């Protein structure tokens, strides 16, 4: 999720 | 350069030293952060803040502090708590406001  | 701009440039350099990796240095793009422009309506980063100082766009430390808090709040909204970005944002928001309120 998000930037990883 | 006004005495207020100088104050703000000094505060910005000190705040940016708290982000040695440059995670806050430039605008976050959707390529690096999928869906970012959908989730975060008012992006902010240090480079934009520096440009606003130079443009004489801050009337007060208070308006400068609000852009800093916006930058940090966006990182804590987009990124989950257990990430490097969330943790730095929470940490430097607290330490940066304390530093400016001495």
């Amino acid at each position: 999720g998000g930037k990883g | 350069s006004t005495p207020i701009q100088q104050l703000l440039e000094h505060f910005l350099r000190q705040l940016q030293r708290k982000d040695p990796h440059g995670f806050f240095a430039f605008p976050v793009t959707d390529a690096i952060a999928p869906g970012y422009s959908m989730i975060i309506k008012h992006p902010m980063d240090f480079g934009t803040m520096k440009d606003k100082i130079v443009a004489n766009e801050y009337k007060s430390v208070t308006e400068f502090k609000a852009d800093f808090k916006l930058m940090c709040d966006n990182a804590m909204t987009y990124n989950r708590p257990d990430t490097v970005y969330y943790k730095l944002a929470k940490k430097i928001l607290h330490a940066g406001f304390k530093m400016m309120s001495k």
Side-chain angles (χ1 to χ4, degrees):
Chain A
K3 276 176 202 182
Chain B
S1 189
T2 67
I4 284 162
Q5 287 171 297
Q6 298 160 21
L7 179 53
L8 299 181
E9 294 283 7
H10 171 93
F11 280 165
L12 183 66
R13 287 189 289 269
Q14 286 309 121
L15 294 174
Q16 265 199 289
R17 270 196 280 264
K18 307 190 187 321
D19 169 41
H21 288 281
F23 296 145
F24 280 112
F26 302 119
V28 178
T29 54
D30 289 346
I32 80 111
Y36 197 90
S37 61
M38 173 173 81
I39 289 157
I40 290 310
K41 277 126 191 176
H42 299 112
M44 188 50 54
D45 61 279
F46 280 134
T48 298
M49 292 182 60
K50 166 70 128 60
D51 293 344
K52 293 180 62 177
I53 306 170
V54 171
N56 210 21
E57 278 171 359
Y58 294 115
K59 300 274 150 138
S60 65
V61 175
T62 304
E63 292 176 356
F64 177 86
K65 287 165 130 171
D67 263 355
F68 183 59
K69 178 170 194 295
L70 173 60
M71 177 180 85
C72 289
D73 281 349
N74 285 348
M76 289 186 288
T77 294
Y78 180 84
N79 299 283
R80 302 179 129 198
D82 30 81
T83 63
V84 163
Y85 308 108
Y86 183 103
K87 283 171 178 157
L88 181 69
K90 185 163 180 262
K91 179 195 200 170
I92 76 173
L93 176 55
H94 189 241
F97 265 55
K98 175 161 238 252
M99 172 196 84
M100 298 178 284
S101 275
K102 290 181 175 72

